[PDB]
């Protein structure tokens, strides 16, 4: 798994691979790892599929009830806090690396990381999953303050392509989703749409 989230001005950009493995076998070569938590709040999942699915459902439920009871669009920080609570309270029984990202009329586009421990931190960009290890350098040398939405899109696309190329537990197709006040724009990069890099020959 390789998940990624980049914050820009008007909102955020989410990206994930589509490979779900049980050992060296690929149980699903076309997984959806970008999961809507609310109208403009998504989560990127990594770790145990059961755990992340269960937690995401629970958070979606809680946040739905919460938003109805407040009659307001929920804060991204709130969804992130819910994930944080669950992932921290049951840290010894869950294997989940989550990235909560979305837009919010109060604080705009935001990205939060909730890694395996159960801590929560806001970041300009976040990466997670097995493949993330291979793109720390790239993402550190390529990132730049004040990227446009399309720039962030191309950015996550490239990073994920690299990770998927190197990581065996990552691969398949690329799933992207831009989130802003405008709404949610999901797209899928497959085959030749996936960025390629000159491979060493002689």
């Amino acid at each position: 798994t390789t998940i990624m989230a980049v914050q820009f001005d008007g909102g955020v950009v989410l990206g994930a691979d589509s490979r779900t493995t049980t050992g060296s076998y690929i149980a699903n070569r076309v997984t959806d790892k970008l999961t809507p938590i609310h109208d403009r709040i998504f989560c990127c999942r990594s770790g145990s599929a059961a755990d992340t699915q269960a937690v995401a459902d629970a958070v979606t439920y809680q946040l739905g009830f919460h938003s109805i009871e407040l009659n307001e669009p929920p804060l991204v920080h709130t969804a992130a806090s819910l994930f944080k609570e669950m992932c921290y309270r049951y840290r010894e029984d869950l294997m989940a690396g989550i990235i909560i990202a979305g837009w919010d009329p109060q604080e705009g586009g935001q990205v939060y990381s909730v890694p395996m421990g159960g801590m929560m931190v806001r970041q300009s960009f976040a990466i997670g999953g097995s493949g993330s290890s291979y793109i720390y350098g790239y993402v550190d040398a390529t990132y730049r303050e004040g990227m446009t939405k399309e720039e962030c899109l191309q950015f996550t696309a490239n990073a994920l392509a690299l990770a998927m190329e190197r990581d065996g537990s990552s691969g398949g197709v690329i799933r992207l989703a831009a989130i802003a006040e405008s709404g949610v724009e999901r797209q899928v990069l497959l085959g030749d749409q996936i960025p390629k890099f000159a491979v060493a020959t002689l």
């Binding site: 779900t20 076998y25 149980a27 699903n28 076309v30 997984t31 145990s48 599929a49 059961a50 699915q53 269960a54």
Partner: protein, 220 residues
Amino acid sequence: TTIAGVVYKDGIVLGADTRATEGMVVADKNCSKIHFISPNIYCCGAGTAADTDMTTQLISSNLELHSLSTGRLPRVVTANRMLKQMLFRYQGYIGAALVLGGVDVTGPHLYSIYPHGSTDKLPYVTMGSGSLAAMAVFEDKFRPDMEEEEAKNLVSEAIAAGIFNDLGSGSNIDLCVISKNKLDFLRPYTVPNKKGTRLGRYRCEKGTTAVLTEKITPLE
């Protein structure tokens, strides 16, 4: 065990083999692995047999209650939710591996459900010891929007791949076809396997077994 499921133009084809093994010994040559959930929803089961039995029966019951109350036909998402939440609650200790398929108001839907409680919604799925062979068949010969007989042929081919390439699988092939207005519970589809005809007559004649004690008890 080899079970599979596929989504075609008018609905869903489920497939299963019929061998039940205890260790490396065949106990059942005609095990039924395709379970009734609701009139529009069926479920193939691999993994721990008793667990798939009880899980599938429990969910069938709760769904009957649900539809009885709602007066409507059950949705596949409902079955998926009930199954996955029950299974997650038990942390994999309930060894149910499932292929869940059905037809709704929203159309045909196929999920694969793992004993830990994770699910995947896919146009084609395989579970069991023979799942890789069947998956090979699918990945080679699957196209979207197939017709009924084509889909049945594909699924039976995958189940056959499992049967002949996996020691855990064997015997007959069961299919279940579910469309917007038809339910073909073909059991079994086609038995590509037969015991060879007995060359001998090992029939024992009366009196060949020595008896120490007899006691006749008349009934009614």
